[PDB]
Symmetry: D2
Subunit: 419 residues, 4 copies
């Protein structure tokens, strides 16, 4: 079934078809002059997928306030309906990332709805950074690393429950992000808290299926404002290495200290086989959770440059889990996710354009200027025609947001859902 009427998609595509053909053929000629087959690029782009977060489908907020828009999803099922629009139009988000207990519901029905909507399920996300109804022990002072054994045990069990839910819907991974840390010096004993966390994670790993992966996600601060147990990629590596082969690190772009060279962290994790995946978003100050590429698009490209280089170097068994993790506080969540997915494919596409042979030559000869210019020749290329054509060829929209607004989808759900 189609959330967006097929005639609206066709109409909006036909209206822009002529211009797209002109832009695509022109770019094709330009790339051919550069020794690149535009068709080979498009083919790869239409294959690049990134999972959408269920928690990003509704309007987000801050500790200061939340300003909901119209037609806010009432639960996971409405969220899946809205996620179906993102996939239908961009064709880059076939899978949805669930968060428990927020999306708690009959797995069987979740699966049924997903299949009907043409959606799949990516990594499960546990939640021990907030208390649930009827919960016996509070996570106020931590969860997996809490000083109280009973609390750690409760956190572990919750994670195992997430695994059972995921197994029922076709998920093959569990992502663990906790707020565990301290707001005051002395509040926690850094080492003992980390020891407790490792012990609890070992239990989760013990209950992890052999066809699943376990992702730990580091974050410098927030909700903890002095120390955080899994504060950076260094601690994250120690975690993954200690836990086992099925345990890897997840890198969320907005979770690093100011000025951090994040693309280097990505390369380091790849070299040691611990790059489990990504949580895409953009930011300027802290963990802003803004639309990917909206603030520093070149950084996004540089991260993808390390991903594409890994293949070029011949790295094996490298299949990162790509996921979007954003908060949409002042825009229509669907439009933001649409353009964010587009931005991610944009950076990927540009990374594919890099002349690796030329770059390698300039790196060996220490020709810094030509090396950086080689990356820019790729980054400066406007790949929108390729992105648009990929969508068109796969059942999507030439201009996703334009088609979305032309459909009146938002007003529609605004009438079907409360206020």
């Amino acid at each position: 079934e189609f959330r967006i009427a097929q005639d609206v998609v066709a109409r909006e595509n036909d209206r822009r078809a002529s211009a797209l053909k002109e832009d695509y053929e022109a770019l094709g000629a330009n790339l051919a002059r550069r020794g690149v087959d535009i068709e080979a690029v498009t083919a790869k782009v239409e294959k690049f997928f990134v999972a959408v977060p269920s928690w990003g489908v509704g309007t987000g907020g801050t500790r200061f306030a939340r300003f909901p828009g119209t037609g806010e999803p009432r639960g996971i099922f409405d969220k899946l309906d809205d996620c179906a629009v993102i996939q239908q139009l961009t064709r880059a988000t076939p899978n949805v990332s669930l968060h428990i207990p927020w999306d708690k519901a009959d797995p069987k029905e979740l699966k049924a709805r997903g299949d009907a909507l043409g959606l799949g399920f990516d990594a499960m996300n546990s939640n021990t950074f907030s208390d649930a109804p009827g919960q016996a022990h509070s996570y106020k002072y931590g969860s997996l690393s809490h000083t109280n054994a009973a609390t750690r045990a409760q956190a572990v069990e919750h994670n195992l429950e997430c695994i059972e839910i995921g197994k029922a819907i076709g998920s093959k991974a569990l992502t663990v992000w906790i707020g565990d840390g301290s707001n005051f010096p002395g509040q926690s004993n850094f080492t003992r808290a980390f020891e407790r966390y490792l012990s609890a994670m070992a239990e989760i790993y013990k209950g992890l299926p052999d066809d699943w992966k376990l992702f730990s996600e580091h974050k410098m601060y927030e909700p903890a404002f002095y120390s955080t147990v899994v504060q950076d990629w260094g601690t994250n590596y120690l975690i993954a290495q200690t836990l086992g082969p099925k345990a890897q690190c997840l890198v969320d772009l907005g979770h690093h200290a100011p000025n951090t060279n994040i693309e280097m962290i990505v390369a380091r994790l790849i070299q040691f086989g611990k790059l489990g995946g990504f949580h895409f978003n953009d930011s300027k100050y802290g963990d802003d959770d803004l639309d990917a590429g909206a603030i520093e698009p070149y950084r996004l490209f540089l991260v993808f440059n390390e991903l594409v280089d890994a293949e070029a170097r011949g790295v094996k068994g490298f299949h990162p889990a790509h996921m979007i993790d954003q908060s949409h506080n002042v825009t229509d969540p669907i439009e933001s996710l649409i353009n964010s997915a587009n931005e991610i494919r944009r950076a990927y596409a540009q990374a594919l354009l890099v002349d690796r042979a030329a770059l390698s030559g300039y790196q060996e000869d220490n020709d810094a200027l030509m090396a950086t210019e080689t990356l820019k020749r790729a980054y400066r290329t406007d790949v929108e025609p390729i992105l648009a054509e990929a969508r068109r060829r796969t059942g999507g929209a030439v201009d996703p947001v334009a088609t979305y607004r032309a459909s009146g989808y938002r007003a529609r759900v605004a009438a079907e859902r409360p206020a």
Copy 2:
């Protein structure tokens, strides 16, 4: 009224009196060898006050979750009862800073309760960074700088109402902090948004009594994550200078970019007569709103060094409105505010110990090492005895938190107030 039984305070003070006398007398001798009269210091310390935020006596949270404790205050009246405890025990927080609409209530009752509790009222705080029930225009895309004229007018009207409430309870200032800004490049036109803000604030300024002050508070980011209209002290200065003599700038410790030299900003505002006041707290990453001095006590001292240097050089027309602005997410809010107020007096006391003449000499001689060492000799001095003695002589507790816990106050209000439920934050 005495929130904390006098017998407990006396009991807990006598239990520590002997140790205090020994420490106080020892410190006094040391200071004497330093040409300092401990009594002169203690006298000023007893008179140093910092306002407490009404919204700070309740447990705070993040966008991810809130973990309330027991006996959470229901509203302004419970909050005043809790603030009274802080004042009774530390004697450093005689005034409370109200926030509207949160603390909206009959002005007469507020004033009545404050008087009974021995609490006065500091600067009023307006709220146009969130929407209230029945609100005609949403502040989602801004308030005083919103592109919609009606929305700005509504924001202006609200601020004027805050001034009316303040006049009825004894307040003499309005503090304006808004979230206005943008999350994406292009979303806002920086200049036009600021022009709109200046015009709206000019309307609020017109409603100020002659003995009132309007304080604008800058913040680099949050809730806006790309740009903020009142992002730094520079923009804040432009506001104060444009609005008028009664308009000044408020400096909130955690509202600056990483590595910012905050004490310099303080010195600059003082130099140009626009230091309206301070919003105390500490931080390590962003606007963490942590207990004052819990992360960087030296920085807190350095800020007070600028305050004392001015307070000494006569600098007339210098009466900064000091207030604590913190969020207590993992501690009993009352205990945190108590120790925070203590840390602020600690920094003050230490700044008072600085040998101004010696420092001036080293500055003129460019003796950087001795200059910084002159500051350290004051900072390194454990002034706890002075703080404890000041509290004792004014009806406070030698060890505030120890007395607070010995009184069983938290268990008391926990048994009088409805239970609270932990929940998520505004993230979803």
Copy 3:
């Protein structure tokens, strides 16, 4: 001609076919967007940025300096090299001189410039290092030094820079100093600033009627605890205090981490104190890297503010544009060439923004379409426009490739002896 004309012609011819195809393709695309590529090219070809005489030589850090071959031996060699950048990019007709590094007879400097087809931008004073025979050291400051005699000496040096500038055609004096402290208590923040203000008022006194005095703020380095002119707030107070001729200069790499620099630019413009820019890029501190090599979008956003100013019709708005970089691991000439290109690139893209649509989205608070409107301009590859602007004005379609084909570096390497001590 520093670079042989036949080389430029040959290299331009070699790339003519591809340029035509890309330019005309871009022209059609822009036309579909209601933009006249010819109008953009006409503006781009007139956008100039001054080159720092001190950036033509290889730079270094406190840890080491690794010079390349043919390092300029003095200001005259530097002008010769600056002529190469201008001839090939046609984007840098003016040079920024630094005194005493570039001290020489004004008559000869002017004559050399005229002969090379170069002009002179704002003069730059130097009281952040000690020169031979100096009566007072700037170790503890200059214009804000506690010692009156030291400040007087600093003032006289700045007045001397104005005299030199008047003789060569300059119309401004840029003042950046290292004055500050490395320890709390070392300096009295207020008194230090007052001393600076008094010294600057004297310098202002020596300004011709058509001259400007630019003060440049910097968060830290060389001072590591406090700096007198630490940020734009202090900078604004300086310009407002000094007078009409005093304005603020924004050096991109001089701000605290995560600072929204484009907002500072907008604020200074609103209050008429944006004197000019020192373009460069950075990731950590005042890295002084090639403009746009690290955060090209930020560079674009700064230009978006400059162009919006023109759109809003700000009166008498003529910021002084200058590159202030250090080239530690590349051929200084090649980096300056590509840096000048990046600046014209960001400028060109800013010109492409559909202001009409943007204006609408800002009013309707359509944040997504507003940012997408900026992106549609930024994502456009304007290289064809930059290349055509150069072709039309006697420059090179691909500046660096032409520079390399000319063998210039090897030429000056043989002509210039490397310093031995």
Copy 4:
């Protein structure tokens, strides 16, 4: 003796009375807290930190260096000055050498050291700068350079440092390089790191059985885009990969803004890879300022982690501490003296923490009392302890005061020719 004994005795007696009063008063206060001041003093007088040979000379920035009087030239002058610091503070018995700056006949070095009462700590290699007559430049890197012969040269140099160290009593080699890139694409992050790991493996092979190899991470400078050994994560990967004799060095000012450094210290200790800590303070970047002059609490929190480990004696926890600072505006000797003092101060205060009480508040999640338990130790003025420790071990009650009374600076000023005067 560098400083006349009668001067030391005179200035000590001058302050003996007040010191008695303060020490006895603190001893009483500590007794009421269940702490025996004598146990603290005994440990403090035994706490040492190596002094960098390159720290006694005036430091500079990329803009300038303002030398003071009596600047030490050569390792022999430097050792003479380092002897003053040790004699007065008794906290710096060992000096860390840097090759090739301090190159000299090992036997003469060992001799001068023994004569001055100074030992030698970790050796420090230098492949972040080029020495005259060098076959291959380190402009584009050293141990991770793309050119094999260049890496081989860097490796050989480090081995030579080990040979020098074995001859003078050293037991470790510290490796800090500037290797990195200033532009995206310039280096392939992974390949560069692979080359570095391979080169370090060769150096590791040259290590005696009782030697250690320390690698030092740094976020940036001299490289302003990427640095091979950029943080503790990469550093840990290096140490774990090389072997048991390889550990990581943590330099306070080499971290990203707001980094929780004390946690990094805890993590490395937990995994047995904390080789040592390089002390200094900072506010903006790698400012290399006097320890504790900016954030003394942070210094205390680092020692809180160190003392907690020293108490339990953790596996492989035997840190090799050193001061790594640059003194640009003070008498280097005085700064090193007060920096060593601050280090012992934070150590003494950390020793005062009631670990039992702390652990109790941590287990009950009583955050307020836990942080207050730390503060009760930190707020304690341990100067009386530091001064008594010095007095008992042949040092000065007030180091800097005694230094100034001795007229030492004026003395070496008369023996050493300044660059100009």
